[PDB]
Amino acid sequence: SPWFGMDIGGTLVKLSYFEPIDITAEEEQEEVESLKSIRKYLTSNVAYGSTGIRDVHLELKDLTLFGRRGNLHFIRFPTQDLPTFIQMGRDTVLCATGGGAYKFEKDFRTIGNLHLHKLDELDCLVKGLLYIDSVSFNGQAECYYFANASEPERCQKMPFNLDDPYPLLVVNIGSGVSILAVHSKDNYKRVTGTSLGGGTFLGLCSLLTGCESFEEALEMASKGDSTQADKLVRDIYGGDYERFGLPGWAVASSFGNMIYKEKRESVSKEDLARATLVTITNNIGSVARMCAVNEKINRVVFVGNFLRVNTLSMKLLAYALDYWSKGQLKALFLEHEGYFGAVGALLGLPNF
Amino acid sequence: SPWFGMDIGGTLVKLSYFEPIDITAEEEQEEVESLKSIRKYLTSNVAYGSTGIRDVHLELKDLTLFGRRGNLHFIRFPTQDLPTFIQMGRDTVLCATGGGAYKFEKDFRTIGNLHLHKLDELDCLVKGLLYIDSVSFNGQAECYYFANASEPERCQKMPFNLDDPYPLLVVNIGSGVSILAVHSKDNYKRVTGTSLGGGTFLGLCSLLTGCESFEEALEMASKGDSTQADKLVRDIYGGDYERFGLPGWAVASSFGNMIYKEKRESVSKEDLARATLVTITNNIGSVARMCAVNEKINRVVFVGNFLRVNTLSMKLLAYALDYWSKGQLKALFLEHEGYFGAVGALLGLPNF
Ligand SMILES: Nc1ncnc2c1ncn2[C@@H]1O[C@H](COP(=O)(O)OP(=O)(O)NP(=O)(O)O)[C@@H](O)[C@H]1O
Ligand SMILES: Nc1ncnc2c1ncn2[C@@H]1O[C@H](COP(=O)(O)OP(=O)(O)NP(=O)(O)O)[C@@H](O)[C@H]1O
Ligand SMILES: CCS(=O)(=O)Nc1cccc(CC(=O)N2CCN(c3ccc(Cl)nn3)CC2)c1
Ligand SMILES: CCS(=O)(=O)Nc1cccc(CC(=O)N2CCN(c3ccc(Cl)nn3)CC2)c1
Ligand SMILES: [Mg+2]
Numbered sequence: 001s002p003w004f005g006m007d008i009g010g011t012l013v014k015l016s017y018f019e020p021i022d023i024t025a026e027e028e029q030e031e032v033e034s035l036k037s038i039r040k041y042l043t044s045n046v047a048y049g050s051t052g053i054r055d056v057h058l059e060l061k062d063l064t065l066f067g068r069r070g071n072l073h074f075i076r077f078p079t080q081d082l083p084t085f086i087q088m089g090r091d092t093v094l095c096a097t098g099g100g101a102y103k104f105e106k107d108f109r110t111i112g113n114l115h116l117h118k119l120d121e122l123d124c125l126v127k128g129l130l131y132i133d134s135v136s137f138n139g140q141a142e143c144y145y146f147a148n149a150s151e152p153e154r155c156q157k158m159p160f161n162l163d164d165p166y167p168l169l170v171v172n173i174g175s176g177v178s179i180l181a182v183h184s185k186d187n188y189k190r191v192t193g194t195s196l197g198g199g200t201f202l203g204l205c206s207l208l209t210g211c212e213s214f215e216e217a218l219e220m221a222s223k224g225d226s227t228q229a230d231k232l233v234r235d236i237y238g239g240d241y242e243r244f245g246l247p248g249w250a251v252a253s254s255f256g257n258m259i260y261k262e263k264r265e266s267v268s269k270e271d272l273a274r275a276t277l278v279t280i281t282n283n284i285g286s287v288a289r290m291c292a293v294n295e296k297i298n299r300v301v302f303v304g305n306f307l308r309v310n311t312l313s314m315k316l317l318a319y320a321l322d323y324w325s326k327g328q329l330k331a332l333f334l335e336h337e338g339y340f341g342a343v344g345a346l347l348g349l350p351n352f
Numbered sequence: 353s354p355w356f357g358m359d360i361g362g363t364l365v366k367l368s369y370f371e372p373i374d375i376t377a378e379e380e381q382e383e384v385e386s387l388k389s390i391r392k393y394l395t396s397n398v399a400y401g402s403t404g405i406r407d408v409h410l411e412l413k414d415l416t417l418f419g420r421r422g423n424l425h426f427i428r429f430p431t432q433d434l435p436t437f438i439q440m441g442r443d444t445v446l447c448a449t450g451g452g453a454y455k456f457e458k459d460f461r462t463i464g465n466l467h468l469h470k471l472d473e474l475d476c477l478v479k480g481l482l483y484i485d486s487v488s489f490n491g492q493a494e495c496y497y498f499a500n501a502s503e504p505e506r507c508q509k510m511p512f513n514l515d516d517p518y519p520l521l522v523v524n525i526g527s528g529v530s531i532l533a534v535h536s537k538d539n540y541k542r543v544t545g546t547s548l549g550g551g552t553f554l555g556l557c558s559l560l561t562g563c564e565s566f567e568e569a570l571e572m573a574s575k576g577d578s579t580q581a582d583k584l585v586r587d588i589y590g591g592d593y594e595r596f597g598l599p600g601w602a603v604a605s606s607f608g609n610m611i612y613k614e615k616r617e618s619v620s621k622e623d624l625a626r627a628t629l630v631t632i633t634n635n636i637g638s639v640a641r642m643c644a645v646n647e648k649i650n651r652v653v654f655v656g657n658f659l660r661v662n663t664l665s666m667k668l669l670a671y672a673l674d675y676w677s678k679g680q681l682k683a684l685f686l687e688h689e690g691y692f693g694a695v696g697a698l699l700g701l702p703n704f
């Protein structure tokens with residue numbers, strides 16, 4: 001049976017596959033032809049169907065897992081296309097997490113003799129994050145931060161060490177946002193959550209700009225000016241609100257300038273895309289800072305796929321968390337953002 | 353000179369006017385004709401120009417202020433129409449607060465011999481809130497709450513006593529949101545703020561629904577179904593996420609269902625109006641709960657004009673704060689929501 005780990009989220013399905021590389025000549029013969037077909041199909045292709053993609057750059061090579069050496073692959077496709085994935089399988093023990101592990105449980109059982117073990121989203125995320133950081137990113141650091149995020153000419157990506165990870169605040173930005181407090185390998189809790197996450201950015205941007213992909217929305221946002229839609233502190237005061245340390249550039253009312261008809265007619269759809277990204281990202285950073293202060297944790301790590309190929313939100317989170325906390329909080333990022341739940345699910349395989 | 357108090361916000365100008373009713377026959381003669389014209393104009397009309405409105409139902413009658421008896425009037429008009437207000441005046445000591453007191457300072461000085469004293473937004477709000485509650489709403493309670501907000505058949509407006517107000521968390525929902533911690537009459541601080549406030553609701557609703565007024569947006573929202581645009585917990589899990597006490601009706605991703613083109617074509621503009629209101633209101637309630645727990649305050653009072661003639665957001669805030677805090681936090685409301693800054697400004701008159 002192939003070694004899979006699956007995280008079926010509200011938007012994307014994340015799959016981690018361990019490809020054995022220490023296969024003996026005897027094991028090759030005893031290998032069923034289906035096992036050879038799936039290993040070939042997954043390793044000989046980087047695009048599966050019309051919506052499946054293998055993130056080759058994230059592959060962990062020559063990893064010792066469950067006593068065998070192999071390569072850890074990372075694959076994603078939209079949850080909307082899961083019925084196609086299941087239909088291909090109908091023509092194995094599967095450890096699955098995320099909300100879709102429960103919603104689509106009966107659908108997975110349509111595969112004959114398939115064993116489905118539902119694992120919790122929290123346990124898989126924590127165990128997956130701690131594991132990937134422990135085995136490193138092919139010798140490189142899994143965790144990184146943006147040094148000197150306050151100054152753009154110095155803002156550069158730099159590695160960060162998590163050999164003593166606790167305490168840790170995990171901000172999972174998926175369709176929504178989940179915030180976890182990790183005090184030990186077995187002591188972690190979900191602090192809170194907010195429904196304004198990646199789905200809000202993509203949903204609002206589609207309504208406002210007509211964008212047809214997450215990548216197209218980011219490209220629109222890169223060419224836009226969010227101040228054309230947002231009302232700033234200087235729009236209300238004429239300058240900085242120094243009594244409470246609020247600079248003039250700070251946003252006072254997101255989309256606040258859109259109450260005037262003349263500015264709705266002048267705003268570009270690139271501006272609305274940027275304003276949507278800024279609004280969602282700033283609110284997540286503010287909520288993350290509030291939970292960090294209440295939980296008394298100074299390291300805040302951001303995961304989920306809202307931040308993939310999304311450097312603007314990362315830089316925005318890095319600058320915001322450093323400025324507003326006056327340097328006491330650290331925004332941290334991980335190379336394998338959206339796959340930790342799938343890895344944690346795969347790590348539950350020996351328990352069955 | 354007339355006794356005015358003005359709060360020039362980013363969206364609305366709030367004006368409090370004390371009309372003397374104990375005027376003697378000698379004072380009437382010594383009264384200049386301009387003083388008689390303005391008192392007549394403000395008391396003989398409920399609509400000033402095309403955008404000014406006097407909230408007659410909020411008037412405080414037979415109030416003893418500064419040693420004289422009189423009526424306290426409450427008037428509002430859009431900040432966009434302030435140049436008209438100033439032009440009418442050009443053809444008096446004015447205590448003004450809000451961001452517009454600084455932005456439009458030079459404009460007020462165009463009125464000959466006018467004395468403009470800028471007062472801070474925080475001091476006027478706290479002093480205005482505590483004053484109106486102390487003198488009551490014509491014998492009735494200024495503060496009220498929604499009892500049994502968990503059960504709709506029992507949810508009813510009930511008075512609330514604030515004779516010992518401290519501690520108190522004030523959530524000022526204007527264009528943005530400001531959150532204040534009030535520990536005493538002279539010990540209060542701005543905890544934090546979020547740019548997702550009333551301006552975000554009105555701005556986004558105008559972009560999505562083409563609404564042309566705050567009242568029209570609320571009427572659209574009353575006829576809509578926010579679940580047509582929001583992705584719920586049951587949309588991701590198929591039911592309740594009982595591991596973390598999340599019911600199936602809870603929103604997992606605001607506007608999250610709008611990532612699918614088929615649902616963007618099926619959603620009504622009434623649904624988008626409701627989803628905008630719910631998204632903004634729920635996020636404010638969640639932020640208010642987080643600040644209340646960190647500040648260790650159990651009474652959260654909501655002010656600003658985002659909640660005027662807006663019972664849905666009030667009921668939403670009342671239900672959310674009671675449910676998610678498991679009954680430990682209380683959502684409180686005040687009859688004179690958006691005028692406390694203007695009252696506090698007027699109360700600074702003896703200091704000049
Ligand atoms: N190719 C993509 N398609 C859709 N969304 C993408 C894509 N790439 C990045 N994203 C962003 O990543 C977010 C989803 O991230 P993800 O962590 O996978 O959430 P999820 O697990 O599927 N939902 P949830 O059940 O709440 O965890 C989307 O809302 C987008 O903002
Ligand atoms: N007639 C109205 N016109 C516009 N907005 C209204 C109106 N009535 C209620 N509102 C709502 O009330 C919000 C403004 O409330 P308000 O407390 O007066 O803010 P403000 O003080 O002018 N802005 P700020 O400078 O940030 O305090 C608007 O964003 C609307 O959501
Ligand atoms: C990965 C879990 S998921 O699959 O269910 N998706 C998901 C993603 C983000 C948020 C949520 C919902 C959530 O966490 N809530 C707790 C905090 N809330 C509030 C709201 C108002 C108030 Cl006054 N107080 N608290 C709103 C409800 C779900
Ligand atoms: C009445 C005062 S006003 O006139 O200036 N209007 C106004 C209304 C609401 C909010 C604001 C701005 C504000 O309070 N901020 C502090 C908290 N923020 C963040 C953002 C990200 C992070 Cl990581 N941490 N903190 C954002 C900035 C202004
Ligand atoms: Mg997820």
Ligand SMILES: [Mg+2]
Nearest residue numbers: 361362450526
């Ligand atoms: Mg205001």
